[PDB]
Amino acid sequence: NSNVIVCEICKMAVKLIVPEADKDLDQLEKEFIQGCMTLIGWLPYAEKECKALAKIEMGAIKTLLENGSAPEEICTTLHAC
Amino acid sequence: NSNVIVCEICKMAVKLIVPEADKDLDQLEKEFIQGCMTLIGWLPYAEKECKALAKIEMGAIKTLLENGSAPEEICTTLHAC
C-alpha cells in the first residue's frame, strides 16, 4: 500500500545482508528484528510483524542477490521503493 | 518507539472524531480502518493492527476530549508527537 517504512525496513535488511560473505539466518535475524522494532515497535503487534518480515524480507533479498539483481534495485523490485 | 505513523494514524482519528456531534463507534471505525490500512496495509498483520488501533486510538481520543484536552495536544499526550 503506502510502503514508506517497509521500504526503510527493506533498505535496512539490504545493509544487513549484502556485505556478508556468509549469508544465512545466523542471528542476522536478531539484528534485523531490533532495527525492525526501532522502526515499528509502537504497534500493538509489532513483534509479530518483525518476526515475519525477517523471514520475508531477508529471504527475498538473499535470493534476488543470488539471481543477479543489483543491490540498489532490490527494494524497488520487492516494494516499488 | 519511532512513532512516525502512529502519529499520522492518531492525527487521522482526531480528524474523524472531533467534528462529530455524535461521538460513537458507529461505523466511524470503518472509515478509520480504511485510512489506517492506507497507512499500514503493506504489513503482514496490517488488518489486525488496524482493528486494534481503531479501539485504542479512538477510545483514547474520545475520552481525552471529554476531559478537557485541547484537540491539537491529544496526539502529543498519547504518542509524544
Author numbering:
A (entry chain A), B (entry chain A): 7 to 87
Please give the exact wording used by the authors of the publication that reports this structure:
In this study, we investigate the structure and biochemical functions of two SAPLIPs from human (Necator americanus) and dog hookworm (Ancylostoma caninum), Na-SLP-1 and Ac-SLP-1. The structure of both hookworm SAPLIPs were determined in hexagonal space groups, and closely resemble the fold of the Sap domain, as known from saposins and other SAPLIPs. The fold is comprised of a four- or five-helix bundle, where a kink in the third helix can lead to occurrence of two helices, α3 and α4.
Ac-SLP-1 exists exclusively as a dimer with an experimentally determined molecular mass of 19700 g/mol (MALS; theoretical M = 19062 g/mol). Despite crystallising in the same crystal system and similar cell dimensions as SLP-1 from human hookworm, the crystal structure of Ac-SLP-1 possesses only one molecule in the asymmetric unit. Ac-SLP-1, despite being a monomer in the asymmetric unit, crystallised as a P2-symmetric dimer that is aligned with one of the crystallographic axes. Buried within the dimer interface is a flat hydrophobic surface constituted mainly by the solvent-exposed side of helix α3. The buried surface area of 767 Å2 corresponds to about 30% of the monomer surface, and is thus above the threshold for specific interaction interfaces as established by Janin. The most striking feature of the Ac-SLP-1 dimer is a long linear groove connecting the large cavities at their distal ends. In contrast to the human hookworm SLP-1, Ac-SLP-1 does not possess a prominent cluster of basic surface residues, but rather three small isolated basic surface areas, comprised of Lys-17/Lys-21 (α1), Lys-36 (α2) and Lys-54/Lys-57 (α3). Ac-SLP-1, in contrast, shows no such feature and has a well ordered internal side chain packing. The trigger event that leads to disassembly of the membrane-associated dimers may come from the tryptophan residue at position 48, which sits in the link area between helices α2 and α3.
